[PDB]
Amino acid sequence: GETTDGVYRVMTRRLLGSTQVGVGVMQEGVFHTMWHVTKGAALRSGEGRLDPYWGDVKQDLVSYCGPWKLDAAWDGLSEVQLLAVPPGERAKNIQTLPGIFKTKDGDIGAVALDYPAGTSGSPILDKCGRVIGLYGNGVVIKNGSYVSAITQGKRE
Amino acid sequence: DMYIERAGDITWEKDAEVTGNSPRLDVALDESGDFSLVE
Numbered sequence: 001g002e003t004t005d006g007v008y009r010v011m012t013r014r015l016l017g018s019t020q021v022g023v024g025v026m027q028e029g030v031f032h033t034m035w036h037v038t039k040g041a042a043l044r045s046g047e048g049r050l051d052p053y054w055g056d057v058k059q060d061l062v063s064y065c066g067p068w069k070l071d072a073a074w075d076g077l078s079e080v081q082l083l084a085v086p087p088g089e090r091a092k093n094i095q096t097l098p099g100i101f102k103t104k105d106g107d108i109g110a111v112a113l114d115y116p117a118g119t120s121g122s123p124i125l126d127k128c129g130r131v132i133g134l135y136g137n138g139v140v141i142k143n144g145s146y147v148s149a150i151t152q153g154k155r156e
Numbered sequence: 157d158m159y160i161e162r163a164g165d166i167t168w169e170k171d172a173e174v175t176g177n178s179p180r181l182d183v184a185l186d187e188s189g190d191f192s193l194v195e
């Protein structure tokens with residue numbers, strides 16, 4: 001089916017109507033998304049079937065048709081763009097300066113942008129348009145707003 | 157049964173709506189892949 005590079009909605013028919021459960025990135029023939037979106041299940045692309053290849057509940061990532069391809073990193077300095085793909089609304093680039101997740105295992109970029117859960121897996125881009133991670137796994141702050149980790153996989 | 161629908165190209169757009177703050181947060185990642193707020 002559709003294998004072109006780009007950003008995709010993940011939809012289901014298992015609820016009322018058609019519901020966007022999340023988002024992902026087709027690159028080099030591999031679909032990348034967040035584990036919590038698909039829960040490891042197979043996907044449809046026209047007739048095309050996409051079968052999972054790699055996943056880790058803890059990283060909260062999953063790849064389909066191959067291994068994780070996306071190896072760019074936040075430089076820790078410059079602004080980035082969430083290419084947000086919200087349920088039933090159009091792909092819109094939002095530019096922001098990441099803040100920081102401080103963890104015992106080290107420091108991660110974080111993006112403080114509020115969207116519905118069905119935006120999980122939207123890609124985060126550097127100034128060269130490279131995917132430096134995915135949005136939609138993080139924390140709910142004092143306000144009630146969401147802060148997301150810039151969640152990137154490891155390329156082999 | 158889940159399916160995918162293309163939604164756009166992966167490109168940096170000059171003149172994108174610039175917003176969101178930049179918080180420094182202490183967090184813990186659990187085995188289930190859920191982040192939580194340490195203080």
Ligand SMILES: Cc1cccc(C(=O)Nc2cc(N)ccc2C)c1
Pocket residue numbers: 036060115116117118119120136137138146189190191
């Ligand atoms: C308000 C908002 C925005 C974006 C994502 C989420 C969220 O809940 N993510 C998520 C994380 C994990 N770890 C598991 C399941 C889900 C659905 C919530």
